Design an enzyme around this catalytic site. Structure first.
Site, PDB file in Angstrom:
ATOM      1  CB  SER A  12      -1.000   0.054   1.143  1.00 47.06           C
ATOM      2  OG  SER A  12      -2.170  -0.532   0.710  1.00 47.06           O
ATOM      3  CB  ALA A  37     -13.322 -14.256   1.770  1.00 50.22           C
ATOM      4  CD  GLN A  38     -12.011 -19.773   2.177  1.00 56.81           C
ATOM      5  OE1 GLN A  38     -12.012 -20.821   2.832  1.00 56.81           O
ATOM      6  NE2 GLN A  38     -12.356 -19.727   0.890  1.00 56.81           N
ATOM      7  CB  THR A  39      -5.274 -15.474   4.321  1.00 59.12           C
ATOM      8  OG1 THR A  39      -6.038 -14.557   5.103  1.00 59.12           O
ATOM      9  CG2 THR A  39      -3.906 -14.885   4.071  1.00 59.12           C
ATOM     10  CG  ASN A  45      -6.476  -2.261  -2.104  1.00 52.28           C
ATOM     11  OD1 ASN A  45      -5.394  -1.682  -2.023  1.00 52.28           O
ATOM     12  ND2 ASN A  45      -6.836  -3.199  -1.250  1.00 52.28           N
ATOM     13  NE  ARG A  60      -2.871   3.961   6.043  1.00 55.09           N
ATOM     14  CZ  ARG A  60      -4.181   3.878   6.272  1.00 55.09           C
ATOM     15  NH1 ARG A  60      -4.801   4.737   7.069  1.00 55.09           N
ATOM     16  NH2 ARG A  60      -4.859   2.865   5.758  1.00 55.09           N
ATOM     17  N   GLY A 108       1.947  -0.506   4.581  1.00 51.84           N
ATOM     18  CA  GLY A 108       1.707  -1.367   3.449  1.00 51.84           C
ATOM     19  C   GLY A 108       1.608  -2.794   3.905  1.00 51.84           C
TER      20      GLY A 108
END
Length: 347
Positions: free
Chosen positions: A62, A121-123, A161, A285, A300
């Site tokens: 990020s 949703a599932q890594t 994103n 940020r 990130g």
């Protein structure tokens, strides 16, 4: 003003703690107005045993959003983009609502649904699904658009994103060049960031790098080497590769006013509230530290890498910290402490 002295013993303790919580390696570099502080602990490759060092290249995730924002803000300086013009003015028929503006997209106030909520949703299964895929910007926007917006245009902060995928699409449409070319000509080359690359969709990290290890969702599960992927699911939202020195250079240059006009840098620091100790400007940020000072930069998270890159208001002190694992909130929260040690100093 002037900052307390960085606390090296404190930083050392932070890295050691991150290792005890599951990070194979962790490192931090502080550029304190010309005096370097550099610490590392652990392994860059857990299989071969190579130690991690502060010169190892890694995926910044990020933090890429700040590079994208800088290019866009330079386009505003050049008169090619107006922050308050509708996104649809530049990309006709893209968004369902004409009121969504560029400024809203850059500050995460557009209401665009974040497609990664579906993807990951599932890594581990999600990573396996996209690691070797190549998406066009349109592909990602369409994924977002299958869901309604989450709020009225400009109404509230909601990290997505999708906003920086729209950013990449804007840069390319307006300049007629790929985002890789724009990053190179406008940032990497001028700042001489020799460890910084945007190689999408290539899966290889150039040079000596730290490997990334994805923590599975199930407690106690074996780590997955997630180093080589296209990062095509993020692109202008998170595919940049860099090092601790290059990110320190970049954020110092940004805060000291070397990357855009003073007017656009003030626009970038127009804070939208995230929570009680954080704000988000335009691809930037703000984090409020315990000792009363605020630092600016970006965090990130990309599979296998957690990055914190922040600089003081005037850019005289910058810090980049990296732990080569992700999906491990303990490591994530622990690594944030490098900011306290580096800027607030000894307690």
């Amino acid at each position: 003003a002037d900052l307390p002295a960085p606390d090296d013993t404190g930083l050392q303790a932070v890295l050691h703690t991150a290792l005890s919580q599951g990070a194979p390696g962790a490192m931090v570099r502080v550029d304190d107005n010309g005096t370097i502080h550099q610490l590392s602990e652990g392994v860059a490759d857990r299989a071969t045993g190579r130690a991690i060092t502060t010169t190892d290249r890694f995926r910044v995730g990020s933090v890429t959003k700040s590079f994208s924002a800088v290019v866009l803000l330079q386009l505003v300086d050049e008169g090619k983009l107006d922050l308050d013009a509708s996104v649809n003015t530049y990309l006709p028929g893209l968004l369902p609502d004409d009121r969504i503006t560029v400024r809203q997209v850059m500050s995460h106030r557009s209401g665009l649904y974040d497609y990664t909520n579906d993807m990951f949703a599932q890594t581990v299964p999600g990573f396996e699904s996209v690691r070797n895929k190549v998406f066009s910007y349109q592909d990602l926007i369409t994924l977002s658009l299958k869901h309604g917006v989450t709020n009225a245009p400009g109404a509230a902060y909601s990290y997505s994103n999708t906003n920086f995928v729209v950013a990449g699409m804007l840069i390319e449409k307006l300049t007629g060049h790929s985002v890789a070319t724009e990053y190179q000509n406008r940032i990497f080359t001028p700042l001489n960031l020799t460890d910084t690359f945007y190689v999408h969709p290539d899966t290889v990290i150039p040079g000596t790098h730290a490997n990334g290890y994805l923590t599975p969702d199930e407690a106690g599960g074996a780590l997955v080497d997630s180093t080589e992927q296209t990062v095509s699911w993020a692109q202008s939202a998170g595919a940049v590769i860099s090092s601790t020195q290059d990110l320190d250079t970049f954020f110092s240059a940004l805060m000291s006013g070397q990357l855009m006009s003073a007017a656009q840098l003030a626009q970038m620091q127009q804070w939208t509230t995230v929570n009680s100790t954080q704000g988000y400007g335009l691809g930037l940020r703000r984090r409020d530290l315990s000792c009363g000072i605020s630092v600016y930069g970006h965090t990130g998270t990309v599979q296998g890498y957690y990055t914190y890159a922040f600089a003081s208001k005037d850019g005289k002190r910058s810090v980049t910290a990296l732990a080569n694992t992700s999906n491990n909130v303990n490591v994530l929260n622990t690594m944030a402490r490098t900011l306290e040690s580096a800027f607030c100093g000894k307690p």
